[PDB]
Paper text:
Enterovirus D68 (EV-D68) is a small non-enveloped virus belonging to the D species of the Enterovirus genus within the Picornaviridae family. The main structural features of EV-D68 capsid include star-shaped mesa at the five-fold axis, narrow depression (the canyon) around each mesa, VP1 hydrophobic pocket directly beneath the canyon floor, and prominent three-bladed propeller at the three-fold axis. Binding of cellular receptors or treatment with acid trigger a series of conformational changes in the virus, resulting in two expanded uncoating intermediates called the expanded 1 (E1) and A (altered; 135S) particle. Here, we show the discovery and structural characterization of a two-MAb cocktail for delayed treatment of EV-D68 infections.
Our structural analyses also identify a new uncoating intermediate state (designated S3 in this study) which has not been previously reported for picornaviruses. Among these states, S1 occupies the highest population distribution (43.8%), while S2 and S3 occupy 22.9% and 33.3% of the population, respectively. The S2 and S3 states largely resemble S1 in their external appearance; however, detailed examination revealed differences in their capsid structural features. Specifically, the N-terminus of VP1 is externalized and the first 40 residues are missing in S3, while most of them could be resolved lying underneath the VP3 in S2; the VP1 C-terminal loop (residues K270 to T289) is largely missing in S3, while captured in S2. Noteworthy, VP4 is completely missing in S3, while part of VP4 is present in S2 structure. Moreover, residues P43 to T54 from VP2 AB loop are also missing in S3 but captured in S2; residues P168 to T174 within VP3 GH loop display significantly different conformations in the two states. Our S3 state fits better with the 18947 A-particle in the capsid protomer (RMSD: 1.61 Å) than with the other two structures (mature virion and E1 particle), but with significantly weaker RNA genome density than typical A-particle (with genome RNA). For A-particle, the N-terminal tail of VP1 is externalized and VP4 is expelled from the capsid. Subsequently, viral RNA is released from the A particles into the cytoplasm, leaving behind an empty capsid shell (termed the 80S particle). Taken together, these data indicated (1) the viral particle in S1 adopts the native configuration and remains intact; (2) the viral particle in S2 resembles the E1 conformation; (3) the viral particle in S3 represents a previously undescribed uncoating intermediate state, which likely occurs in the transition from the 135S A-particle (with genome RNA) to the 80S emptied particle (without genomic RNA).
Author numbering:
A (entry chain A), B (entry chain A), C (entry chain A): 47 to 48, 54 to 80, 88 to 128, 135 to 269
D (entry chain B), F (entry chain B): 1 to 50
E (entry chain B): 1 to 174, 188 to 234
G (entry chain C): 13 to 43, 54 to 244
Amino acid sequence: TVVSETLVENFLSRAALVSKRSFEYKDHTKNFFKWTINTRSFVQLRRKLELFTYLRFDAEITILTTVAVNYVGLPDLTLQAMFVPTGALTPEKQDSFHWQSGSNASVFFKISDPPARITIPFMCINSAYSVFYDGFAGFEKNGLYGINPADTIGNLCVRIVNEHQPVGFTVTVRVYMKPKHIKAWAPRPPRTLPYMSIANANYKG
Amino acid sequence: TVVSETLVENFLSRAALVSKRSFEYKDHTKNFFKWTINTRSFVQLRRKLELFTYLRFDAEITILTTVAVNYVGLPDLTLQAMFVPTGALTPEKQDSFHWQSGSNASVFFKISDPPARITIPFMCINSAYSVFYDGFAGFEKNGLYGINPADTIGNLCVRIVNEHQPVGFTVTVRVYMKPKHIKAWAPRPPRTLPYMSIANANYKG
Amino acid sequence: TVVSETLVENFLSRAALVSKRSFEYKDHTKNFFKWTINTRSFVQLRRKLELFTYLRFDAEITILTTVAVNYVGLPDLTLQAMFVPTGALTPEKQDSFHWQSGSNASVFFKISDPPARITIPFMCINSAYSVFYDGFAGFEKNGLYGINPADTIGNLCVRIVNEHQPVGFTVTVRVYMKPKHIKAWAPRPPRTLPYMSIANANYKG
Amino acid sequence: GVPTYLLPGSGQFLTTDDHSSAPALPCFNPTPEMHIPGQVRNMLEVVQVE
Amino acid sequence: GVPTYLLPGSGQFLTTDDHSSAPALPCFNPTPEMHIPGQVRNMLEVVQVESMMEINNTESAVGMERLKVDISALTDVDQLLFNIPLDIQLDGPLRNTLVGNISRYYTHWSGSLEMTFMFCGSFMAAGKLILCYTPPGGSCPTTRETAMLGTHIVWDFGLQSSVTLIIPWISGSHNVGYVTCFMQTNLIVPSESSDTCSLIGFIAAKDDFSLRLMRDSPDIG
Amino acid sequence: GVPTYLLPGSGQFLTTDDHSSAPALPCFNPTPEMHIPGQVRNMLEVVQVE
Amino acid sequence: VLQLKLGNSAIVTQEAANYCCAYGEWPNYLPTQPETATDRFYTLKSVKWETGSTGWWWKLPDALNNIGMFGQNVQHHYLYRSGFLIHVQCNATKFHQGALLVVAIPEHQRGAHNTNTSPGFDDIMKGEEGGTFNHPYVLDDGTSLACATIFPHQWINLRTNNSATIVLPWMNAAPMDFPLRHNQWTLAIIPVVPLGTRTTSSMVPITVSIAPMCCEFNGLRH
């Protein structure tokens, strides 16, 4: 018993895991993953950001790679993390050139090293992101409800640089995102009811 | 035969091992440890701090990890050291999300690297820690004697990031704590008699 | 055919190996060494320092560890080099706590890394070390001749942090000492005759 | 150059650390900031509301 | 950027090193510091406080009477009361004190000490004593006059109720000093007062007492 | 922070190098220096003696 | 001879000068006050001190839980911070010999002999009755009595001075504390030298007075 830290900048900024995926790799004789890096998946960060309406921040992405065992020993793989911004169409003919195009930003990192850390700037047509968008997607007149085409950051694409390695090890990739330079507007009420789906606001009760 | 170093800051500040534990790992087909990081366990640091009543310091935690052999060779594991502050309830459903919540501070380090070193700030309701507390825990009227609920730093939780690795090696973790910015008040007499229990001051003689 | 470097500071200061030991390690189903780090053992540094009477310097200790083979491959061991100052009694109950006491200064280093380098300060009761001491040890009246109890630096204790590793490799440790801030007094004649024993000045001829 | 030595705990990943990192898309200018009513710079302003 | 090269001994973990590390919980403000009486910024302030010497240490001596030395009225003239060794590491009367317990964390100790004696007997107790100190290697006194060759003072029960003794700068590190006390005259007490009186010794440290070279306490418990 | 790159020959141990290293026992004050007759700061003074 | 008058009462005492301030400070106000309501010295029950008396201890404010006017405000308000002026006067003739050590132990954790069981509520808080030292040589906390002088203390010798006055300011980590839970100080009278007399057994009374000077209260209820 018995204002510095109360600031919004320190409140919304924390390191959390927004994506968890492990691809099975044993014998292929492909391996890759892409995701829209959105805050509606991880449940604790979602409700954390449901408090505010519009948000302005720079996403800081850090990729942590761990290799498990399914004594051989752990070889050192080379991984490539590429960020695909919104507007780049993806006609995937893998084994050939899209990844290696100089337009998209890519980073190379080994297994044993400081985790790869990149800072994504603020990419928007409008002034800030829209967490709550009342309306429909584009002008289709019946277009999708609850999704604003104006705000899409892009897709995070990560693959292994080296060719097939004859091991039965499974590669585990963890992606942490800590926002910086956070600006808040229009605080809203918290949502006590559970999340039925990430696509809209429907509640069960 | 025949005052700089005599200062309290240099006297109480030294690197000592406050926790020693090694979990047996061979075949699981879990692995983790948490402890309250208190100074009453290690016997030389206890009596070292029994000289003074109230203490104000910032704990500096350093985790040293060594892998033994029960020639294969030593793979490089990825470990996660998370600090759980006081007030966070622990309903452990392992294999799922508590560890990875962005609220608790976590650090990642490999086996071969400089030892992970973090500085825990001063977390208290009152002005300084209480080594000698005359009274009872909370208000239960018969509540526990000798333990002050006002001062609890938290629990240090460490687990391996990677999944099960098919080796018979045992991981040994060593945690050293060197306090800094030490402020002392009310020196007391040393205790010559041995320690019967860490929960109270009872003596044998 | 046909004063900067002639200075005493550059003359006495050089990197030399004062201790060479390799412990046999194959199967134990202990491993450690301690020595008084004195200059009377290595023959070239002894006569190098027999030129002067009193000396004031700060010993700089560097531990170089190499692992031989008695293809498996070389694992990375974790070693602990602890310095025991004069006055600390050694009741060794190994496998338990003396090494890990926070009073003695310890350092941790891996096999592959820059060599561990520490600088031991000047620890003496008097103003400078005594290479030539005419008298007896303490006051025993018949106490040992040729050894001054006033000057003892301590013992250098080094052990492996990890537990027993099932390999037949032998660990070789090399300790180099380069003195710094050297101050000289009372130069003496060189000793041409060989050294019969390191405990006293007896000559053969 | 400048001789340096690694401190204990170098290269680890901390969750609460704050440091500058290399930007992903250089030479990109974000949209300027329009004035949006109800700027909240502190969480106590939300709490003080009845 | 700036080219750098690793120095020998980089990345090692030292126990005695002092460096800044990344904080675990940023944007956290610790509780402000209230003023707490008795702030101790130096360990010498604890040592300078007087402490109780136990002079009664003998066979079958346990408990409260180890702090006092019984003196009856049946004692004779010139009888040795006790001797106090000055060795801190060994066990004298100084084994557990404020100066002794703190010095066991160190090795080299140099400084001047002080001893204070207090007579707890009745008010009417008469007689005189002798208080002498032994220099290092000082030919420990057989009876009396050998102790007189050094620094000494005649202390009376009636006049002074306390003793102030300044000992000149002993030294020790890893038989030197002593304190000799005898009976100058007989103990004179009235018929109503008790025959047995006692004393309590004290020791403190002066301003020149110095310490260094931290180590581990030899006593585990 | 400050980007740096390792120069060729970094991390090696040289015998003749002179650099500062971390002290083993901090907060320790060595014994002050009393004046000792016959201070020799150069090896030529010993040689010049007959 | 000099009477110390505080409030509506007073007690005849020895000349009071150069009184001991604990850790060299005095109980100032925190940067209503009971200079009238609860002010006057509260004299506890006089304990009989004999040759075989080990000692006594009164925790603060354990002996004061219900005493006079101060007993009302203990359970009445939510928090307080209070200083203490302790005057222990032991009356005896010139034919009695002995010594009494009055020392104030801040944050005293008691203990038991040869068991790991922690004491209960009735063993810690005894109220006004007060306890008795089980083993005063070890202070019952496991420490030693020889080095126990580090605290504030005064010496009562039947030769020089038969009374002692110790002033205790507010010692706590928190600015205020709970009345019935935590005990900040402890008052202990340690008979280092036992009693001795011509007769086989005698009785020497001891008077203890405590003044809660310069305090405050908050959390008015009831």
